[PDB]
Amino acid sequence: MKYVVVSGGVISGIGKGVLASSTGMLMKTLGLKVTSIKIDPYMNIDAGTMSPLEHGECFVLDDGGETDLDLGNYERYLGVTLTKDHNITTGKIYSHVIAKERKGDYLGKTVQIVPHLTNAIQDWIERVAKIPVDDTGMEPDVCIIELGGTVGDIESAPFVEALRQFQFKVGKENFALIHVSLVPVIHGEQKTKPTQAAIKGLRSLGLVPDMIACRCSETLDKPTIDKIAMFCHVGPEQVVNVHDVNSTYHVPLLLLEQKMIDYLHARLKLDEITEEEKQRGLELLSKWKATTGNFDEETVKIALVGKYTNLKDSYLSVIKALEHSSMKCRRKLDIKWVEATDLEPEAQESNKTKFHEAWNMVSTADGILIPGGFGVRGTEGMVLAARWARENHIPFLGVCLGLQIATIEFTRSVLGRKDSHSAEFYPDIDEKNHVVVFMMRLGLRPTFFQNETEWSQIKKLYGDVSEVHERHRHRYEINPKMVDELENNGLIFVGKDDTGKRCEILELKNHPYYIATQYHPEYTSKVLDPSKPFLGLVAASAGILQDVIEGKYDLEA
Amino acid sequence: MKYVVVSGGVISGIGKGVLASSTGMLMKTLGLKVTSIKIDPYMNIDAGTMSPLEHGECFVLDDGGETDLDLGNYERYLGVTLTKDHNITTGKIYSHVIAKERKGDYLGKTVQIVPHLTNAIQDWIERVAKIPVDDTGMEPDVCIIELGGTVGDIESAPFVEALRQFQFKVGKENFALIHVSLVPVIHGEQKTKPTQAAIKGLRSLGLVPDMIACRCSETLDKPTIDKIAMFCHVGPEQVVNVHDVNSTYHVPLLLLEQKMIDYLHARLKLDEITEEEKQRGLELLSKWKATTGNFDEETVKIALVGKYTNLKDSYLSVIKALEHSSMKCRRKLDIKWVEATDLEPEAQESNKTKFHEAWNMVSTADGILIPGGFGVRGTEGMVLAARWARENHIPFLGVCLGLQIATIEFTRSVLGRKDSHSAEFYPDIDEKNHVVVFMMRLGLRPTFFQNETEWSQIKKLYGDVSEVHERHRHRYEINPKMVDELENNGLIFVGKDDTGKRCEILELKNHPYYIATQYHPEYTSKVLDPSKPFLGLVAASAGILQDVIEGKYDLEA
Amino acid sequence: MKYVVVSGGVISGIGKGVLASSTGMLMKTLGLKVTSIKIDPYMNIDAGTMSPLEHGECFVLDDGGETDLDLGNYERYLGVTLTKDHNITTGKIYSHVIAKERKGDYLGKTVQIVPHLTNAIQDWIERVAKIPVDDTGMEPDVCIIELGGTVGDIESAPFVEALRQFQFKVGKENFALIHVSLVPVIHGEQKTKPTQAAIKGLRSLGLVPDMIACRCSETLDKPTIDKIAMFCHVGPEQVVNVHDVNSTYHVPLLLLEQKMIDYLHARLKLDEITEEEKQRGLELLSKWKATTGNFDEETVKIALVGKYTNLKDSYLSVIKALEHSSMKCRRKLDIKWVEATDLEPEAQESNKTKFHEAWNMVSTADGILIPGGFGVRGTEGMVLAARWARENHIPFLGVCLGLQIATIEFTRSVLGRKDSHSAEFYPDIDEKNHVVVFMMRLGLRPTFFQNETEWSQIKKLYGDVSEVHERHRHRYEINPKMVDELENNGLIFVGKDDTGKRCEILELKNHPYYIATQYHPEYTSKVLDPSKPFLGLVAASAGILQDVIEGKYDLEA
Ligand SMILES: Nc1ccn([C@@H]2O[C@H](COP(=O)(O)OP(=O)(O)OP(=O)(O)O)[C@@H](O)[C@H]2O)c(=O)n1
Ligand SMILES: Nc1ccn([C@@H]2O[C@H](COP(=O)(O)OP(=O)(O)OP(=O)(O)O)[C@@H](O)[C@H]2O)c(=O)n1
Ligand SMILES: Nc1ccn([C@@H]2O[C@H](COP(=O)(O)OP(=O)(O)OP(=O)(O)O)[C@@H](O)[C@H]2O)c(=O)n1
Ligand SMILES: Nc1ccn([C@@H]2O[C@H](COP(=O)(O)OP(=O)(O)OP(=O)(O)O)[C@@H](O)[C@H]2O)c(=O)n1
Ligand SMILES: Nc1ccn([C@@H]2O[C@H](COP(=O)(O)OP(=O)(O)OP(=O)(O)O)[C@@H](O)[C@H]2O)c(=O)n1
Ligand SMILES: Nc1ccn([C@@H]2O[C@H](COP(=O)(O)OP(=O)(O)OP(=O)(O)O)[C@@H](O)[C@H]2O)c(=O)n1
């Protein structure tokens, strides 16, 4: 096997993940089977305790674990299904060694941070790097290991020990390291010294960088590359630079044009790794040239309406799912961020100025999106945003709480029933629009189209396939008692579960595009294969939905 | 409250504990209420998993937890009952913060090594420093904090962060630090540089030493003190030196004569802390002058016979209990270490040379001691050592497995019954000398003298008090069915438990001193109050037992 | 005596000098006698070898040494005459200890970087801090020590050793340190970690900061101050911040409003230092409020015409002399930078675009300034700039080479004599406008007004005083043979030397303001007392020269 560490810097937030999965996207250009592990220095075992206000969205796996949010950036860049084990954390590995301590697997020795815990970390990395995350069941050929925090943190010290020892447990010419570092510009001059002091830190703990990659406000000057390479064990051609680019999807072409892989090919001796891989490599490059061409080659404006949209990382997957689809439509994406509570009739006396800004965004947008918010607060405004797109023929997608609110609105305006509300307003009883279903429903579950719905815009985007598979995170579903009334009035539930009891998709009959999903489709959007409910929202906002379904926008003929 | 850190060095094993409890023994000279916490960098939560072969003896508390062995050094030096919480460990504190993470006590924040875990360590130290470990229920006035490992270890990095922040959570003029450091002598010259490089390490993590204390092969030269104080923020009078001394019990007088406390009095402003304390201070000095005088002011030879006596830390408490008692008898202690298996009739053909060395030690000794060994291996030789002291009137003490073997021997030689054995040889059934009693029996439990036994040598040493309280660690007891036969033949069980079913002490009727205890009395021996079963063993080995009971050797008239 | 170190950072160029002399300007607000030392890590003994292209202008002392350029920033901020010894450099101190090594002043000991060279640095700082640099001959009360480079450089390591030892040779409560450090803003967030890593570096070498001062793109957030003070031994009120301000002369008011001195008063216990000082303190504050008011309370455009004006530090003193004077005139300064060679008739075919930009600047400006350039290259354009201000009544000042070019132009256009040139064009002989006078003429020399010249605008600005004292740097003077012809034609030499042979000032008779000086007056401009030849240039460019001479712009009535 081969391995690539990505680590480093004098600051957290320097750029690692885009240098990580982006390096891993280019390993796939070579045809390689590829995987990724994110080592987190924080002490949470999983994101299941972490509220979406800090550390952001609880990204959800095929295996239904609530992981680190960043893992998602690797399931888009590489096109892989990761597992709950691919997110190593400081709380996860202290728990695993402490479990073995009380089980007595150390044969009554004292157990130490070195060597026992640093062995555990190496034994975890080489365990997880066997798992076949890729489009065929063979073990990966390269693993990208991203070390979070900064080298020289008292929180990241166990992992730089474990990785140093791993440079020997794995050989040189099988392991390599990319160190990501800061070139601050002040008084209009690129200063090298934070890279010198952080490389001094790196060699102290015993890792040696095979590349340096700079966060800089500028293109690195020719002398800045020379004054970094005069102070580190790299040639001047391995001081990589992730400068400003037209969009984040260009970074793997930037790295490849900086000859980043033409070194890793030699430095990891990758001639030592079938025709299927060689072909899938060339196809991945062709599909990259296609999505890149679709950026160079008109705007679509979408209002995303939810709770606390100020906290923009809390909707990260939704943004990326709109970006992947917008490159298929060749159209520039312009998300308007609306706080749902600023739409409310009460906000007009409380905070009038922001209420007009919110309503201008809703009124301007070519599509509306209710994104599957957290908790009840935004609901009253999200109803009025769903009403705005039901009545006037604006394209719409509701995700999770958005299907809940598409159904509350269609109840509250088409059936009358003005008292109806989410099951969250428990003591109203008779007018609850939803029912509890704890089984929380999580992870990849199927959904089956209702066999008559040949008219459907959404089941056309899915290619007329009989079923779909999707991620879930819900404790409530629409009350089955009401669903005949909604189906008879035209809010047709075009997809349901295995039992047929659960409301998984709706489409409003005879509207240009009004969909909702109980699942979160943004947790399976990929850059070459955009998630179909979001592709339909962009394509109908562009007024091109028919031609996307007919195939005028696939990447290769 | 006031606090004293003891930390440091370029090596583990430099001398901390003797500089720690010894500094705490002198805080008690001032009359202060005193406590101690040992911070261990290892990842075991407790010594209950740790086999006695590495990290040594599982020291046992009043509260019955199997602690770090070193805690014992503080219950002898200070005269305090500690608790399971006074041994902070890396496995204990990661478990406590990870429990709060899954309970959700962090209100859905991400939880970090800084500040959350470094707050947990400070909140633990100031929690535990409230507990009244002393001879009256008031909270302690000084806490001695010993930081294990070395500063600059990747295992000790969380604790030097937590202690730095603690220098502010507690004030300066309430916290002080003693750093213990190496002066190697090579080519006959004292080199200062390992102290310079380790003090550079110390100030990097942000602690500043109010004293330095040197491990050195010599008295520090006047220039060595000056060349350390020219490189650290200490006066030349605060470079303390724990040099070679007549015995370890002299170290608090060495520190006091080096004016160590005449600085801490000012540096912790201890004028800011009743007549009872002032008196108990002067009495502790008088009792120190007494035990010191008893060292300056003839040898007693004792054979300690057990499994794997090569592993001398595995019997540490037993050695210290013999030392405390030997200073009461004014006699020099000479422990002969015997491997019990080298006494066996089989060892004579297998390894003849060591078998003669073992038997010479047994034949020479003025007393025999079977120390409460671990597992079955040594048993056959320990029987012959008990027989040697039953028949010939040699003084004897059996501790735990030693009472078991005193009873197996008296069965095997006085009752005949040559097939009899420990309950460990389970499938013999009918001839098992013992019975299972799991309740493991642990911690401080009472023991009551049998009301007729006024003749007893051991119940005389206990001052004619009606009951005693002692630590236990046993899964087997002598089978109650047999005890009438043993009592009738003269192996009188002079002490039993609350129920009267359990065999807690035996004394053989009409022998100069042949005792065993099912408890471990070495876990309550103190330097001014020696544990009575061990005092009797030394005093009878000295042939002075009568006069020790009559009071010719108490410290003050 | 008291002392203040200014040091630090992860980068060179962070802001030290403005935090240094600015802190020293506020020590003078307290009435204190004040001095400054700049410690340079570079190996040049003096700027006399250093060409003005790199490290910039060779600033010149009262004592005529070619010093570090930065010393000037302290002679403006404090109002002091420094000496060649106030610029400590790595080349200067290795030379001084190596001289004592060959003289044998070490009594045949081996001489070492510690302690001998670190003693030399301390013995130099306390030597120089005695020298009475101030407006009365008493020794200074505070010394500001600026440590150049960055802490943790292999070039600055001898000085942080010497300063650490100096924290003891001088007492605490006599020495304090200000550490200047970086808060980079990326992704719109202020990151603290470069300050944590550089403070870790600082405490390693053993200095402790009594203040931190941040270079930041922003006002520091309340949490950024707290997260620096949680990681350093400073209160949150001693994390100072030199943010963007209207001009550099506001920084001492910014520091004073951040309560910077209200701490140093207590931290250096400055109550332990006469009515003259107390008065001169209040007067310095009043004069600061005046120059500050003159910034708050119309533009003057000046073309500065010389060689290589792209290298803007090479004219630093000239810029500051124009700033000090512009605050007296209450008018905003706008220096147009002209490359003198772009004015040439040859530049019109060679590089036409830049030639028009140069001539637009010359044609726009309210005054012309020829700044005393280095070498011959710019001369031909500087002639045409002097002609432009002779003929059209534009205000003018020529400094050094500017007097040379004022005289070459007046010769070349008023006397005819079109072949005339600087003595630099040696082989023309008969038409050389100048003569060699090596005595280089340097340092503070007098100049005496010619006793009839009562009409003069410049000798009016000097207050009708009989003589002036000024800095020089010239190897050429105007040929005395010609001076009668120039005086008779109206280029009256209104000031000459002690002998009357040397051309020190000219004024063209009956022009609104056309002055030149052979001396460099910008080497004695001060913020409360602007250098008179530059005050006249700004005041005549403002068309207010009469009223400045009559006194409509002095700071206090
Ligand atoms: N392939 C990627 C990589 C990053 N991002 C986005 O960029 C931001 C985080 O970038 P990252 O590469 O993780 O850098 P930081 O986390 O800012 O810093 P670090 O280097 O510490 O990860 C997030 O919006 C993340 O979703 C993304 O959309 N796609
Ligand atoms: N010396 C330190 C400081 C912090 N941490 C931990 O490592 C993480 C790094 O986060 P970081 O971005 O460094 O936060 P700050 O320390 O505030 O750094 P910044 O100021 O850039 O946020 C911290 O959250 C904390 O978990 C650490 O290990 N060692
Ligand atoms: N009051 C004390 C202190 C120490 N010792 C003994 O000395 C040895 C350990 O000494 P210690 O002070 O702990 O030093 P080390 O552990 O060798 O090193 P460190 O400084 O790391 O603790 C053990 O036999 C311990 O029982 C003792 O009998 N009584
Ligand atoms: N860089 C290191 C090395 C080891 N350790 C841990 O800290 C303990 C210190 O034990 P030590 O006595 O240092 O063992 P060694 O590393 O072998 O040192 P020595 O050679 O003196 O035993 C080690 O057991 C290990 O738990 C650590 O934290 N950091
Ligand atoms: N009282 C001062 C201080 C500085 N400057 C100017 O500001 C620049 C240099 O600022 P300085 O304070 O020296 O910062 P740097 O040299 O950039 O960085 P350092 O902190 O390393 O000195 C130069 O134009 C210098 O003349 C000035 O005009 N007046
Ligand atoms: N590790 C180093 C590197 C350089 N220097 C010296 O200290 C000076 C500091 O200048 P600096 O501004 O640090 O130059 P660079 O090293 O290039 O740093 P920068 O990239 O910010 O210019 C250098 O010129 C050199 O004299 C040093 O002492 N130690």
Residue numbers in the entry:
A (entry chain D), B (entry chain B), C (entry chain A): 1 to 273, 276 to 299, 302 to 443, 455 to 572
Question: Which sentences did the original study use to describe this structure?
Answer:
CTP synthase (CTPS) catalyzes the final, rate-limiting step of de novo CTP biosynthesis (Lieberman, 1956). Each CTPS monomer consists of a glutaminase domain and an amido-ligase domain connected by an alpha helical linker. Glutamine hydrolysis in the glutaminase domain produces ammonia which is transferred through a channel into the amido-ligase domain, where it is ligated to UTP to form CTP in an ATP-dependent process. Budding yeast have two CTPS isoforms, Ura7 and Ura8, which share 78 % identical residues.
We determined structures of CTPS filament bundles formed at pH 6.0 to better understand the mechanisms of lateral assembly. Reference-free two-dimensional averages of bundle segments from cryo-EM images of Ura7 and Ura8 were strikingly regular, suggesting ordered assembly contacts. This high degree of order allowed us to determine three-dimensional structures of both homologs in the presence of substrates or product using a single particle reconstruction approach by focused refinement of interacting pairs of filaments. As we found for the single filament structures, Ura8 reconstructions went to higher resolution (3.3 Å for substrates and 3.7 Å for product) than Ura7 (6.6 Å substrate and 7.0 Å product). The individual filaments that pack laterally in the bundles closely resemble the corresponding single filament structures. Ura7 formed very similar bundles in both ligand conditions, with adjacent filaments staggered relative to each other with a half-tetramer offset. Although at lower resolution, the Ura7 structures appear to make the same lateral contacts as substrate-bound Ura8. Yeast CTPS has a 7-residue insert (residues 273–279) in the linker region that mediates the bulk of the lateral interaction in both bundle types. Ura7 bundles in either ligand state are very similar, and at our resolution appear to maintain the same lateral contacts but with a slightly different helical twist. Regardless of nucleotide pools, bundles could therefore remain assembled to fulfill their role in the starvation response.
